[PDB]
Design a protein around this ligand. Structure first.
Ligand SMILES: Nc1ncnc2c1ncn2[C@@H]1O[C@H](COP(=O)(O)OP(=O)(O)OP(O)(O)=S)[C@@H](O)[C@H]1O
Ligand SMILES: Nc1ncnc2c1ncn2[C@@H]1O[C@H](COP(=O)(O)OP(=O)(O)OP(O)(O)=S)[C@@H](O)[C@H]1O
Ligand SMILES: Nc1ncnc2c1ncn2[C@@H]1O[C@H](COP(=O)(O)OP(=O)(O)OP(O)(O)=S)[C@@H](O)[C@H]1O
Ligand SMILES: Nc1nc2c(ncn2[C@@H]2O[C@H](COP(=O)(O)OP(=O)(O)O)[C@@H](O)[C@H]2O)c(=O)[nH]1
Ligand SMILES: [Mg+2]
Ligand SMILES: [Mg+2]
Ligand SMILES: [Mg+2]
Lengths: 326, 354, 330, 343, 318
DNA sequence: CCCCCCCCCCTTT
DNA sequence: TTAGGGGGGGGGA
DNA sequence: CCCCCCGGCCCCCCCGGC
DNA sequence: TTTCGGGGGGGCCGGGGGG
């Protein structure tokens, strides 16, 4: 859980796993003989399956059932298991695995696992289920393809439904707080596209990559805003225009000189920075924005260390202006 | 030093170099500025809208409008969050970009702007008429990025406090501006400069910078490649000059930005491969683009027009592509997560082509 | 607050006794029988706006307790705090304590209970159950889906219907007698038609009509007065527009629509609603015609709800009607 | 330093024409008599109902309510008898339950002898909720019983552009007043009065063209007239204002450009249409204006059959609806033109 | 009139475990537990009005007897049940000394436990574990999923099924004999049909019908109890001709005063539960219904929108 | 003893 | 029908 | 004159469908 | 992630009362 993050690597972690039927069978048989009720060993594996490895729950079940039924055998195991089944909410990986299984979308499967059950499965975690589905709906081998329908066409239909679900989600989290739309979202974001591409997972199930990408975009936008308001006094544009238009020319007038004149260009670069109130951190951030062929990481690492050291020394050996006086 | 796009930016109405009719209209507006209504300047990006706004302010108040200072204002949400807004100010005007706080832009309109609106002018700012100015000008950049709530908040503030402030909004498109706000403003169309005007401006920059040119056709090529974006044209001229040792030849290639090259590569990949795995790699490319501050609407427009320029596609494919682009642009307007809609558009295009 | 004549008609004519509530005869008879024999259960009045729910419950409280019912009942509505804390303290204390004035039972009126939080509704369950020996609850609502199943399980449900023609006619006659007004039969029919079963609309429109007359003591309210005050289309205008759409060419239909709207500045939405009402009665040979009509007109209404270009919307209405009715031939 | 305070008349004189010529009394409201007469009768009947003004932009709702409050109370008593809240204020459910309710339950401010002698002074106060369509449904629901319970000392006036945003109970409680769109026929008198007051010289039909272009918004028409007057004054020639100048100031596409677009569409070549539209967008024309002009051209053209008009009407409606959502003008316009070309 | 007749749901509330109908096996288990004591921690779950609170109270009374006033602590959603309450009042009750017969324990009855906060539930764990030698806990709820898994581990699960028409008829006949109510078979059939397995609802409707009309027949029952609108909505959605569906919508729902939001929500629920239609068709229907629901929430709640929704559903079904 | 069977549990803000 | 891969632990040639 | 009890804001975290 | 609103739980602050 997120709340456990502070305990990352401070304590010796010891994991206790669900004990199997064999490790406990003697205990339950001893309890049965002491308590004077008949228990068939062949059903113990079932009983644990009912309790999901909860020994305390197993003992409670035995105590409650023995009050009226003194013999536990195959003639009554099914009803006891169904009545005492532990219904725990699934986790995002399990939710994704279940929702994308084709069997539940067949006539018999849909009759056994109903649409209401699928909506409830979504509601096990309504925040993460749509992200899981959008992450893993292209990684399946479908078994629900309609005649004459390619995998690509079903993927396109699912993507359209996911876009509609995103619109509904925006509606829910607006100022009107239309939480009553949550069930509809469940259908549009998760159930419908899954029914369109349900089948067998082709590879491993992956956790949603949208959250990390969103955080990275937020960080880059913050850096871009800082750069923009450092250079506001000199430029005429918005931050988007700064990213799309100014930044390549700033790359040519800030990074290229080091790769051509070595240390002799340091002054010029600093001059440009002083003309736009840019700092060393702004320089690095600017170099961090470029994509595609203009990636700078390898180029920057290839620069001689002496040139960078001299650049830092020269920048620290002078006085610089301030665009924003706090 | 200072980039040529900034060093040679005009600082007065008489220094403007294109769209003479618009210059005359602005001069007519500045002739009797006391009863100036609220203004809304709309037109293609990078044409000179902000330059003309600053020139109009200079004509009204004087050169002091260019003495800009940056300050930071503090705001508190209902959840106790602390937000900071950068305000550019001069002795005569204020400038704000409320979209900087996203959904909290409304607060800026409801607290800061109103506070400015409820203040009368007592400083003796003597004007050409002989009397002191009675209102301060507030510029709202990217006015079309405001949420509907902030626009609604602007409405009565514009009318009640007209004697104290005058608003100048600047946008690249009026589609996202609500009807009441457009009704409350004087709309000014700012057309892009022609190719010849761009060539003249670039030639003046070249002569003032002592750059060798094999001919005047390179400037025309840059103007055509800019598609009417003067800022882009000037930046591209500077980039080419830097890349060719301050000497441009007739064979000097036109430079393109990183994101444009990436989007063109994505278009080629989409055209050549139409498969689910291709869609996965396209998702990776889209994530890379979005992460580095490329707006989703820009990506959609660029990809659509790149696809429409592919010579191997037929009329039916292009019609389907433009229809899907329309639908998914609407989806982007009403959605939260842009990647969902971009992926949907790419999947539909792949289906239509295949 | 200088006199009752200073009140709006919607409040000046609020029923004070169960005999002044019209159009809900079954509910009134049943509740009166309940009170007469001392068999009042927990009540749930469900119905659309302006049908008489609040009026009926207030009149019932007055009948049970008399003129001083206000100090003998606990009335809470959407303008008051009704969180779980209020349920835990104020409602619980009122339900568990004797009356200050008399020895009778206690009445709690939760008006607009559909605006109450789920937690408060859940907390109400055991309060209702435990103190049923001496306390009764009444819940009023327009939207039943906001009420928890547990609360509905504990209440006897009465549905308030949209007001029938006869009840509106009788109340209009009473108001005309009180106000010394004259009303034409056609104007009365138009008023009933625009009422849609809501008495508040009838009263407001009648007050506006009286304000419109130059000499209300001698001038009679004609259908023209109603259409002028409400700014609504006449049936003849709707018939002409529909006939032009279904019979003439595009130029004539466009001209007729624009002329009809400009004559009195009618709203396009009112024309759309009137034409929809007319078309519901039309017998169509093909179901596809009805499908297209309904879908396209619903889309147009939704678009209008957000504004947009009025002329384009009118042309869209014309085109949708023509295209839909082209399906009646083959 | 400090500046001597300006007089109200002098201040209003140097205000924008829309604010300068805002109606000061109910007699100055131009073409809303069907409601203004009912409101005026309240000066004597003193039984003002709860009001729901609804209509398109710039039709006179706010002006009407302000003039009504002035006429009812007077410049001395208005402030004490009015509580105004608009979209620039906080109007959450808590605000409705506490501040609005507290003001509604207060005893009315005491009129002075002069106020009683010179104004009707009805025995109630007024709460104005301007831009009420921005309020949430729960906050609106919090007003229901407050309106009815304190109606003896308080009356509510809700003003909106989209009446569907008002929940059904509130619309039921309020008497509805629909403000009609202001066009040439019903607003030319007021526009001509303003032009004469400002000594604006224009060709015959210029005011009618301005009101046609405004499309039901008198505020827009007055602003356009002021801009044209400024242009004429700066030119300093004495020539009358022409319709061409008004159209250029209003962002209307010239007819020749529209004909070029029509010919390109008639050609049907996708690449040529795309190239022409790319060149066209550089002029900065508003897509909504282009769509409106195309609708006008095609619908009233006698050279197109019924089926073509039936299809193009739906195409134009769809494009306009999409544009209303804040979409990219270039993409929407290109899609519309391509779709028309294939009809 | 200032007098009240005690409701029959309270007058004939079962006082012993033998008077509760339905869920026979669980009731016998409770009877045996009450016989021999040794009551464990238990969680009783089920739908409204089936006898969960009645079962718990009867068990507690039969177990404790004269010591009921001292050995029972009852808390429900109408009482304060925060973490502070769990840590102080419940803990003091569990620690308290009370002499009880050799096979009896103190009982804490947490009715409507699904509304309890997660913090209080967490605090209850070790209190249950440490004081189990003298105190036992009985939870009653409608949704057992709201009870955290650690608490479910320590308790015995008792899921109450819905009452069959036969048990409801038996209880209604008992009450009728006790009250000498005059009825007809059709009246009882209508009462059971409208009750939908809710004994409280059935008894309330019976009493209301008797009070308002005397004779419990079909006509009086339907006059007092309205036909559930979900069935009308199902008939509307299952109609073959668009005209029939529109007629049902206009005459049975819109003219009766049912709100558009209620109609659309009920349509969504019924479509979700329509096991007779193929799941994919149900998904398309739900998409259309959700479009209409979003439009209605936006403020455009009109008969035209619902008619358009029905037209789209019929177009899908054809 | 390493190998295998068999299962459970982690991928995850 | 078992998503891939790692950990645990009883059985055993 | 100083210390302690206990009511009230104030802040911060967490659901939100059936 | 997060755009209102409700609910809960814990931390200080300060009035009043007592010694
Ligand atoms: N049955 C009725 N008989 C007479 N007048 C009625 C009737 N129903 C409504 N009215 C009139 O409309 C006004 C409001 O009636 P209410 O009883 O408040 O309606 P309502 O059902 O409570 O409205 P909601 O549910 O709060 S929107 C009354 O003061 C009456 O003047
Ligand atoms: N009926 C009218 N009569 C005279 N002037 C009008 C009229 N309507 C609008 N105007 C003019 O336009 C200006 C604005 O009028 P408003 O009353 O603010 O319109 P509005 O309907 O309240 O606009 P919205 O709904 O806030 S966009 C007025 O000051 C007048 O100068
Ligand atoms: N099995 C039953 N046998 C006899 N009467 C019942 C039975 N179930 C409910 N009732 C009657 O309905 C009344 C209410 O029963 P309850 O035990 O309160 O139902 P409940 O399940 O606890 O309701 P919830 O879950 O709090 S909404 C009882 O007093 C009985 O009169
Ligand atoms: N020489 C000259 N340059 C101009 C003119 N107008 C704009 N520019 C240049 O174009 C650049 C971009 O102008 P800008 O106002 O920021 O674009 P916009 O606000 O997005 O429309 C400016 O930095 C100027 O250098 C002009 O009239 N003359
Ligand atoms: Mg009411
Ligand atoms: Mg207004
Ligand atoms: Mg219960």
């Amino acid at each position: 859980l997120p709340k456990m993050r502070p305990f990352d690597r401070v304590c010796l972690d010891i994991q206790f796993r669900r004990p199997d039927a064999n490790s406990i069978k003697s205990r339950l048989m001893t309890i049965a003989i002491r308590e004077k009720f008949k228990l068939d060993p062949n059903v113990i594996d079932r009983l644990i399956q009912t309790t999901r490895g909860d020994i305390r729950q197993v003992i409670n079940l035995l105590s409650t059932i023995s009050t009226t039924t003194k013999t536990i055998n195959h003639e009554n195991i099914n009803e006891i298991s169904k009545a005492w089944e532990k219904n725990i909410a699934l986790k995002p990986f399990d939710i994704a695995h279940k929702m994308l299984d084709g069997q539940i979308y067949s006539d018999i499967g849909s009759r056994n696992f109903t649409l209401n059950d699928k909506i409830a499965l979504y509601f096990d975690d309504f925040d993460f289920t749509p992200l899981m589905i959008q992450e893993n709906y292209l990684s399946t081998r479908p078994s629900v393809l309609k005649p004459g329908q390619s995998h690509l066409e079903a993927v396109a239909e699912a993507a359209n439904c996911i876009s509609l679900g995103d619109i509904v989600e925006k509606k829910i989290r607006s100022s009107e707080q239309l939480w009553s739309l949550l069930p509809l979202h469940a259908v549009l974001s998760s159930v419908y596209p899954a029914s369109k591409v349900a089948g067998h997972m082709a590879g491993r199930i992956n956790f949603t990559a949208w959250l990390g990408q969103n955080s990275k975009s937020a960080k880059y936008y913050r850096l871009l805003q800082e750069i923009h308001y450092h250079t506001r006094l000199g430029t005429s544009t918005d931050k988007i225009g700064l990213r799309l238009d100014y930044l390549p020319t700033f790359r040519k007038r800030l990074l290229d000189p080091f790769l051509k004149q070595g240390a002799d260009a340091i002054s010029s670069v600093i001059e440009v920075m002083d003309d736009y109130y840019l700092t060393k951190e702004d320089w690095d951030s600017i170099m961090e924005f470029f994509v595609g062929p203009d990636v700078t990481t390898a180029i920057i690492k290839k620069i001689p260390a002496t040139v960078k050291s001299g650049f830092t020394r020269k920048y620290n050996s002078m006085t610089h202006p301030v665009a924003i006086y706090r | 030093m200072s980039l040529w796009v900034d060093k040679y930016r005009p600082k007065s109405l008489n220094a403007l170099s294109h769209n003479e009719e618009l210059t005359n209209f602005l001069k007519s507006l500045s002739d009797q500025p006391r009863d100036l209504p609220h203004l809304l300047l709309y037109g293609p990006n990078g044409t000179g809208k902000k330059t003309r706004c600053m020139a109009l302010l200079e004509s009204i108040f004087g050169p002091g409008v260019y003495r800009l200072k940056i300050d930071v204002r503090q705001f508190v949400t209902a959840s106790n969050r602390k937000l900071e807004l950068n305000v550019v100010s001069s002795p005569y005007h204020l400038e704000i970009t409320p979209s900087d706080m996203g959904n909290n832009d409304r607060i800026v309109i409801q607290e800061l702007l109103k506070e400015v609106a409820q203040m009368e002018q007592v400083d003796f700012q003597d004007s050409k008429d002989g009397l002191a100015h009675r209102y301060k000008c507030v510029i709202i950049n990217e006015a079309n990025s405001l949420t509907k709530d902030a626009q609604a908040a602007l409405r009565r503030t514009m009318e009640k406090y007209s004697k104290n402030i005058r608003l100048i909004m600047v946008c690249d498109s009026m589609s996202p501006i609500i009807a009441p706000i457009k009704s409350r403003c004087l709309l000014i169309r700012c057309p892009a400069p022609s190719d010849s005007e761009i060539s003249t401006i670039l030639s003046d920059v070249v002569t003032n910078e002592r750059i060798q040119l094999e001919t005047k056709d390179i400037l025309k090529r840059i103007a055509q490649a800019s598609n009417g974006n003067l800022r882009v044209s000037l930046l591209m001229l500077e980039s080419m000059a830097l890349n060719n040792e301050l000497a441009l030849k007739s064979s000097s290639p036109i430079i393109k930005p990183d994101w444009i090259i990436v989007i063109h590569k994505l278009t080629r990949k989409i055209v050549k491969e139409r498969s689910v795995n291709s869609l996965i790699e396209c998702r990776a490319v889209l994530y890379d683009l979005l992460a580095h501050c490329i707006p989703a609407n820009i990506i959609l427009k660029e990809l659509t027009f790149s696809l429409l320029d592919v010579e191997t596609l037929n009329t039916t494919n292009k019609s389907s592509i433009i229809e899907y682009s329309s639908v998914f642009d609407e989806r982007l307007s009403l959605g939260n997560k842009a990647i969902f809609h971009l992926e949907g558009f790419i999947a539909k295009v792949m289906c239509c082509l295949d | 607050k200088r006199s009752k004549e200073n009140l709006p008609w919607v409040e000046k004519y609020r029923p004070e006794t169960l005999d002044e509530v019209y159009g809900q005869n079954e509910v009134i008879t049943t509740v009166r029988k309940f009170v007469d024999e001392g068999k009042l259960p927990h009540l749930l009045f469900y119905g659309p706006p302006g049908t008489g729910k609040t009026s009926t419950i207030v009149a019932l409280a007055r009948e049970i307790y008399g003129k001083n019912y206000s100090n003998m009942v606990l009335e809470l509505n959407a303008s008051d705090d009704r969180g779980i804390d209020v349920v835990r303290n104020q409602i619980k204390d009122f339900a568990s304590t004797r009356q200050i004035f008399s020895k009778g039972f206690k009445l709690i009126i939760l008006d607009e209970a559909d605006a109450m939080t789920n937690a408060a509704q859940n907390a109400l369950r055991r309060v209702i159950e435990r103190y049923t020996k001496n306390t009764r609850f009444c819940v009023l609502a327009n939207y039943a889906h906001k009420l928890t199943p547990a609360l509905l399980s504990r209440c006897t449900r009465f549905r308030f219907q949209p007001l029938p023609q006869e009840a509106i006619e009788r109340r209009i006659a009473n108001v005309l007698v009180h106000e010394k007004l004259k009303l034409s039969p056609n104007a009365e029919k138009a008023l009933i038609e625009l009422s849609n079963g809501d008495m508040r609309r009838v009263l407001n429109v009648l007050q506006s009509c009286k304000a419109t007359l130059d000499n209300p003591d001698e001038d009679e309210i004609s259908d023209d007065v109603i259409y002028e005050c409400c700014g609504a289309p006449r049936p003849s205008d709707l018939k002409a527009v529909l006939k032009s759409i279904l019979e003439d060419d595009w130029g004539t239909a466009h001209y007729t629509l624009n002329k009809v709207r400009s004559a009195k500045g009618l709203a396009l939405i009112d024309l759309i609603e009137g034409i929809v009402k007319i078309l519901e009665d039309y017998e169509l040979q093909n179901e596809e015609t009805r499908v297209h009509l309904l879908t396209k007109l619903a889309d147009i209404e939704y678009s209008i709800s957000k504004g947009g270009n009025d002329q384009i919307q009118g042309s869209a209405v014309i085109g949708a009607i023509k295209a839909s009715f082209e399906n009646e031939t083959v | 330093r400090k500046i001597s305070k300006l007089a109200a008349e002098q201040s209003l004189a140097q205000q924008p024409w829309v604010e300068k010529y805002r109606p000061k009394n109910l007699d100055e409201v131009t073409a809303q008599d069907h409601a203004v007469t009912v409101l005026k009768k309240t000066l004597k009947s003193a039984n003002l109902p709860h009001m729901l003004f609804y209509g398109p932009p710039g039709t006179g709702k706010t002006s009407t309510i302000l003039a009504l409050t002035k006429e009812l109370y007077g410049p001395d008593l208005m402030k004490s008898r009015i509580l105004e809240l608009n979209a620039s204020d906080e109007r959450g459910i808590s605000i409705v339950r506490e501040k609005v309710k507290n003001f509604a339950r207060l005893t009315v401010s005491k009129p002075s002898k002069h106020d009683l002698e010179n104004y009707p002074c009805p025995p109630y106060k007024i709460i104005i909720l301007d831009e009420a369509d921005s309020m949430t449904a729960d906050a609106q629901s919090a007003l229901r019983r407050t309106m009815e319970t304190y109606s003896g000392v308080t009356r509510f006036c809700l003003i909106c552009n989209y009446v569907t945003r008002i929940i059904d109970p509130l619309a039921s409680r309020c008497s509805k007043f629909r403000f009609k769109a202001l066009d040439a026929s019903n607003a030319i008198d007021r526009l001509r009065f303003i032009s004469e007051q400002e000594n604006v010289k224009c060709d015959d039909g210029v005011l009618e063209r301005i009101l046609d272009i405004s499309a039901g918004d008198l505020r827009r028409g007055i602003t356009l007239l002021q801009s044209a007057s400024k242009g004429a004054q700066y030119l300093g020639d004495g020539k009358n204002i022409t319709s061409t100048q008004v159209e250029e100031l209003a962002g209307v596409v010239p007819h020749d450009i529209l004909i070029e677009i029509v010919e390109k569409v008639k050609s049907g070549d996708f690449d040529e249409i795309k190239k022409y539209v790319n060149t066209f967008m550089k002029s900065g024309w508003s897509a909504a204006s282009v769509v409106n002009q195309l609708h006008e051209y095609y619908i009233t053209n006698d050279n197109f059959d019924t089926n073509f008009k039936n299809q193009i009407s739906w195409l134009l409606f769809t494009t306009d609806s999409r544009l209303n959502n804040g979409t990219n003008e270039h993409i929407q316009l290109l899609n519309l033109l391509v779709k028309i070309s294939q009809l | 009139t200032l007098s009240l007749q005690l409701p029959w749901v309270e007058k004939y509330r079962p006082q012993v475990l033998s008077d509760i109908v339905g869920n026979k096996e669980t009731i016998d288990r409770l009877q045996q537990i009450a016989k021999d004591g040794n009551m464990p921690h238990m969680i009783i779950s089920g739908m409204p009005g089936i006898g969960k609170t009645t079962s718990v109270h009867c068990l507690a009374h039969e177990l404790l007897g004269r010591s009921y006033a001292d050995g029972v602590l009852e808390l429900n959603a109408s009482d304060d049940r925060g973490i502070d309450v769990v840590r102080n009042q419940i803990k003091h009750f569990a620690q308290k000394k009370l002499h009880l017969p050799p096979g009896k324990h103190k009982i804490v009855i947490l009715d409507e436990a699904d509304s309890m906060t997660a913090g209080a539930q967490q605090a209850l764990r070790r209190t249950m574990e440490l004081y189990s030698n003298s105190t036992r806990f009985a939870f009653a709820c409608n949704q057992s999923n709201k009870i955290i898994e650690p608490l479910q581990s320590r308790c015995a699960i008792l899921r109450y099924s819905k009452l069959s028409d036969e048990d409801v008829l038996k209880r209604l006949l008992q009450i009728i004999k006790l009250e000498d109510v005059k009825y007809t078979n059709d009246g009882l059939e209508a009462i059971i049909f409208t009750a939908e397995g809710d004994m409280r609802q059935a008894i309330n409707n019976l009493q209301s019908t008797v009070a308002g009309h005397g004779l419990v027949n079909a006509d009086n029952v339907f006059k007092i109890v309205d036909s559930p609108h979900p069935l009308i909505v199902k008939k509307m959605l299952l109609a073959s001709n668009l005209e029939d569906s529109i007629q049902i919508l206009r005459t049975d729902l819109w003219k009766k005063g049912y709100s558009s939001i209620d109609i659309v929500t009920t349509s969504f629920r019924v479509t979700k539960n329509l096991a007779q239609v193929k799941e994919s068709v149900r998904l398309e229907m739900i998409k259309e219904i959700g479009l209409t629901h979003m439009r209605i929430l936006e403020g455009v709640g009109t008969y035209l929108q619902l008619a358009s929704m029905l037209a789209k559903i019929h177009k899908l079904n054809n």
